Amino acid sequence: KHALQAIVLSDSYNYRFRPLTLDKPRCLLPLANTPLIEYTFEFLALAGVQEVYVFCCAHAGQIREYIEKSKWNLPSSPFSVNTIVSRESLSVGDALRELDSKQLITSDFILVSGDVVSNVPLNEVLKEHRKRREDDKNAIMTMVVREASPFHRTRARTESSVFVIDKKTSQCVHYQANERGKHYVSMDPEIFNEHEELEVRNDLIDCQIDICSNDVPALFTENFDYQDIRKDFVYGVLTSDLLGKKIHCHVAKENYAARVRSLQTYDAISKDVLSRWVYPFVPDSNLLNQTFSYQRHQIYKEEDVVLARSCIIKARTLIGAYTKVGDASVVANTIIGRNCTIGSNCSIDSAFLWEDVVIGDNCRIGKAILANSVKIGNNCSIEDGAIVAAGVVIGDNTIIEKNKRLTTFESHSQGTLNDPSLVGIGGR
Amino acid sequence: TDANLQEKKIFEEKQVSIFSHLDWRRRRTTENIPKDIHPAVIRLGLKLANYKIFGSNQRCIDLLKTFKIVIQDYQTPYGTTLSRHLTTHINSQIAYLVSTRPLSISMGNAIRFLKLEISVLDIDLTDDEGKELLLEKIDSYIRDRIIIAGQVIVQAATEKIQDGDVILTYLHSSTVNDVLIHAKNVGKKFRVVVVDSRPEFEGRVCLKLLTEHGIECTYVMISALSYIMQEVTKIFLGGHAMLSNGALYSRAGTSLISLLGHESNVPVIACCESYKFTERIQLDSLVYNELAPGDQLVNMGVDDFEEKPGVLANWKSVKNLKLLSLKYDVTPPRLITVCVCEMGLLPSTSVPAIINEFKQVYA
Amino acid sequence: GNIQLQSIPIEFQAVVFAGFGNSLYPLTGSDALPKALLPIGNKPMLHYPLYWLEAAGFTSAILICMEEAEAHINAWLRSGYEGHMRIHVEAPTILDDSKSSADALRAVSHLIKNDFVCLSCDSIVGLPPYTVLDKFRLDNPSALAVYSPVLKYEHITSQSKEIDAKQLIGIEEKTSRLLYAKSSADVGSDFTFRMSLLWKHPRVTLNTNLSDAHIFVFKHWVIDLIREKESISSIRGDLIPYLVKCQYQKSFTVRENIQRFLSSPQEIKINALIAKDGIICSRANNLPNYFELNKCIAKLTPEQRLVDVTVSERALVGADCMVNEGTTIKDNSNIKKSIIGKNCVIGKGVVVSNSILMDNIVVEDGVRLESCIVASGAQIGAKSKLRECEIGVDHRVEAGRIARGERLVDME
């Protein structure tokens, strides 16, 4: 009967990952040798979704190309996916106001403002949502969030928020952000006359996964000013600007649910999925017919991988297939794409390597992100915070400083092709 | 109380259930309390029944420095002298102080010691005379038998640790924690394995403590022992008491830890203090034990009883279905490879001689 | 005699108050009877907070009174108080209603050696005392209060005398700690919450259904703070929130000197933190300020038995009502769902329903008292019909019939 719909909002959070989104869209970059949206996808499939639409604003072809050739186009897919294009830098709401303008919302549905790594069965949340809906049609949106630590390494400033919920009916009655200049928390006491038992929570993680009802898109057209959901929308509801309607919060107390959005989030979440937190969504399950396998201390390898004898592999590190590693080289807490090649007698700590990447002998690297098919000569060295793009080769006996993002095309950043980079240039 | 009646039911509680004899009776409240009771005892009494992660050794201390205040605030009646009446006063304290939680061995032995020194002092000394030495006799008993022996053990225990070890503890033993903590400061290179178990996950607090010193630790529940034991190289154990045969008496999973270690050829080091030794002897882990209420099992999730509507919540009113949870078991010596007391690293079976090395010091 | 402090020392000492009856205007006027002497189970209100203490295991306690009432209290204490404790009474001349509860306790700063409890004359409780002390005995907090769900009145909307208005209380469920407590009128704009608080105890539940019962238990040391801090009028109003802002907001760093000085309950290991918790249950427990005196009394249905030393002629009826000693009901007059104090007299043709009668009251013939309340010594003329009305002390009303009003002596 009831068609379950769902819409993913790619590109909308393409911001921080600027140096590499120009190489390819962020929805397509690999988390743990696995592209982002797949983590979001199986989550969607886990929700029992039957119909999905994806907004695109960059490399839509490159996006749609993968999708058409993805496993989610085959008849085995639990849901039919179609792609939609619009303007670039898609601010939310403009999607919703464009959405109902196309008229395709059968009933309740979900919303994801980016790409999500999670494993929570939402099937409960729906019956938790559709129930209280069928008596109060003004039940507009159900928000789902993860109970965690207030200082939890996965709670970031974007998600660092404060909710106020009714302990009985789990209705969010007040919400605000946690910007550095918000000392006090204020709310009008009109709620107390309508609510007996309340709970103030700062231990949450705004997963930004939102169960939206049917009126929502049309409501956005009636309220064009709303552009950010968590700032313009919900605030308008609680302020009775948008009147007579109410939302609801579902706090998750088990399993995992986080959203890849910031560079401060990639490294964290990568260290989460490696720590099994998103079982069964793990490399050794090998969703896309990979050849992974678990090893102790959270070491992950694939079939047909070249390791020396003197090469030493510490913990919390994964390795894609067809990838070689030189002698007396040490890798620790890093992830590595497929087909890569590591020189001899090198130290790689907490780095992030992608597909078919080459590294020469004697190289020290830490907290670095190496894009696809980038070569680094011998005697080189990097440090914590660096970022490169595709093909941005570096010549031998070179050094890169912290947080110094690079690129292969001049547009707004620094760096060019070959050897001289920081000291000396290869094009500027 | 009901006296012989409530003292005959106990000896009627001897039937089919192999736990028919284990005294379940408790007093978690100050309701109907007698008046022969010093305040600081009551607080301590409430501490015992309500504290959960506490008292492998801290009880004996917290009991003694409480006892001082009792005798300090005590004064003998004009009729009889001091020693002729003090015990009866203290006897009325422990009787209450039992119904809150049965005595440990560390506490029971200290009591047995205190009642002695009471009976041996000379009558010439007056009250203010008689009291003052007892505190020293107590304050010495604390420093000599407990704290020093700890520092001796911690040194001797850390001695046989080797750079590269991987060592395993089980449910926060304040002694063994002091070892690993001390081990890090000396610069020993290693890492620790922490085994937790249901109900009150006494092990996570050990994880907190160790992690707050930057120790490579690993947290797995007891049912995963078969897995992690391959990694381990040494096993450290802090016991509630050691037995005259050389058996180690500690909490529930203390046996399985020693067992799989043997069948995986890793050693079982028992860090225990001398006064905890006992001339008692027992073979099965059911003759002498202490119960924890089965209601705590109803907690299905990973937290203390809170939003845990366990499907067992009515077991008290379901026939043929009764939960339980011992908190102490008896591990035989064949698994324990060594006990480390302040008398040095000794074979566990060498315990009862050490006890005899005290009755010589005491007449 | 060697009775109370021979063998075992003392743990706490209890103080109770008597604050003029402030809000209980039509009943606290005259100095003939004060607040703490208004009956409840046809027994004066002071009987209950004491019975608790006595049953809690208290040989003797301390009472704070006002000079205008030091006389009758003792007179009742010497004759009337059913209990067995001993009551040191103190009525310092410094008292003046502009100086509230804490100021009174401030004056008796010298007679406080140990930790202590603070009830009020109106701390009507049925809550088992061990649950309170054991809590304080366990967590070893710097303070401990109590709160109960607001009293459900069987009557609904008569007059909006908000009693205590509303009190918003914020606690952390597990740790029991209290983190927010302030009346409404003090903050009506936007209810502030220093977020700096949240980054510890990020889980703050808070109810609006709760009211105070004026039960408090403190470690001793605080009494010095009351001496040093003269700007503390009432315990509820000033002291409690002054403590809760110190639980966090460490910039609230008026020196915590009072902790260090020899007050160790002996090795210096408790200065790490200061705290206070709350506690609730669903039993007879609340605080009468006027409106509750009708209800808190009605809550004495537990008295499910008989009357004594009275005279109700034939052709009369009294059932489940509560009537005290010596009173008299004349022929053809009915009583229902109503209580009557000492030695009152009620003529013929009279009807008293859902109404509260104090002591020594004369009721002329053929009147009606539909859910009214009348003070001691008062007097009411014949053929009078009062509904939802109050009657002041020692007052006479003649033949009038008025509802909703509060009849009282001319008093000029």
From Swiss-Prot, chain A:
Q: Which GO terms describe its cellular component?
A: cytosol; eukaryotic translation initiation factor 2B complex
A molecular-function term among this protein's GO annotations: translation initiation factor binding
Q: Which GO terms describe its biological process?
A: cytoplasmic translational initiation
Per the record, the major location class is cytoplasm
Name the UniProt key words of this record, in alphabetical order.
Answer: Cytoplasm, Initiation factor, Phosphoprotein, Protein biosynthesis
- Statement: the UniProt record of this protein carries the keyword Phosphoprotein: yes
Q: Where in the cell is it found?
A: Cytoplasm, Cytosol
Q: Which residues carry this modification: Phosphothreonine?
A: 158
The family classification in the record reads: Belongs to the eIF-2B gamma/epsilon subunits family.
- Record note on quaternary structure: Component of the translation initiation factor 2B (eIF2B) complex which is a heterodecamer of two sets of five different subunits: alpha, beta, gamma, delta and epsilon. Subunits alpha, beta and delta comprise a regulatory subcomplex and subunits epsilon and gamma comprise a catalytic subcomplex. Within the complex, the hexameric regulatory complex resides at the center, with the two heterodimeric catalytic subcomplexes bound on opposite sides.
Explain the purpose of this protein: Acts as a component of the translation initiation factor 2B (eIF2B) complex, which catalyzes the exchange of GDP for GTP on the eukaryotic initiation factor 2 (eIF2) complex gamma subunit. Its guanine nucleotide exchange factor activity is repressed when bound to eIF2 complex phosphorylated on the alpha subunit, thereby limiting the amount of methionyl-initiator methionine tRNA available to the ribosome and consequently global translation is repressed.
Task: State the protein's name.
Answer: Translation initiation factor eIF2B subunit epsilon
Species source reads: Schizosaccharomyces pombe (strain 972 / ATCC 24843) (Fission yeast)
Q: Which residues of the full protein are shown?
A: 15 to 442 of 678
Curated annotation (Swiss-Prot), chain B:
Q: Using the UniProt record, give the first listed, main subcellular location.
A: cytoplasm
Q: What does this protein do?
A: Acts as a component of the translation initiation factor 2B (eIF2B) complex, which catalyzes the exchange of GDP for GTP on the eukaryotic initiation factor 2 (eIF2) complex gamma subunit. Its guanine nucleotide exchange factor activity is repressed when bound to eIF2 complex phosphorylated on the alpha subunit, thereby limiting the amount of methionyl-initiator methionine tRNA available to the ribosome and consequently global translation is repressed.
User: Could you give a GO molecular-function term held by this entry?
Assistant: guanyl-nucleotide exchange factor activity
Record's keyword annotation contains Phosphoprotein: yes
The UniProt similarity line reads:
Belongs to the eIF-2B alpha/beta/delta subunits family.
UniProt keywords (A-Z) are: Cytoplasm, Initiation factor, Phosphoprotein, Protein biosynthesis
Q: Which organism is it from?
A: Schizosaccharomyces pombe (strain 972 / ATCC 24843)
List the protein's name.
Translation initiation factor eIF2B subunit delta
A single GO BP term for this record reads: cytoplasmic translational initiation
From Swiss-Prot, chain C:
> What InterPro entries does this protein's entry cite?
eIF2B_gamma, NTP_transferase_dom, Nucleotide-diphossugar_trans
Sorted alphabetically, the keyword list is:
Cytoplasm, Initiation factor, Phosphoprotein, Protein biosynthesis
One Pfam assignment: NTP_transferase
Q: Which GO terms describe its cellular component?
A: cytosol; eukaryotic translation initiation factor 2B complex; guanyl-nucleotide exchange factor complex
Where does the record say this protein resides?
Answer: Cytoplasm, Cytosol
Q: Tell me where it mainly resides.
A: cytoplasm
Q: Give GO terms: molecular function aspect only.
A: guanyl-nucleotide exchange factor activity; translation initiation factor activity
User: At which residues is Phosphoserine found?
Assistant: 264
Q: Name one GO biological process term.
A: cytoplasmic translational initiation
User: What is the role of the protein in this entry?
Assistant: Acts as a component of the translation initiation factor 2B (eIF2B) complex, which catalyzes the exchange of GDP for GTP on the eukaryotic initiation factor 2 (eIF2) complex gamma subunit. Its guanine nucleotide exchange factor activity is repressed when bound to eIF2 complex phosphorylated on the alpha subunit, thereby limiting the amount of methionyl-initiator methionine tRNA available to the ribosome and consequently global translation is repressed.
The record's comment on protein family reads: Belongs to the eIF-2B gamma/epsilon subunits family.
Q: State the oligomer form and interacting partners.
A: Component of the translation initiation factor 2B (eIF2B) complex which is a heterodecamer of two sets of five different subunits: alpha, beta, gamma, delta and epsilon. Subunits alpha, beta and delta comprise a regulatory subcomplex and subunits epsilon and gamma comprise a catalytic subcomplex. Within the complex, the hexameric regulatory complex resides at the center, with the two heterodimeric catalytic subcomplexes bound on opposite sides.
| Name of this chain's protein | Translation initiation factor eIF2B subunit gamma
Q: Which organism is it from?
A: Schizosaccharomyces pombe (strain 972 / ATCC 24843)
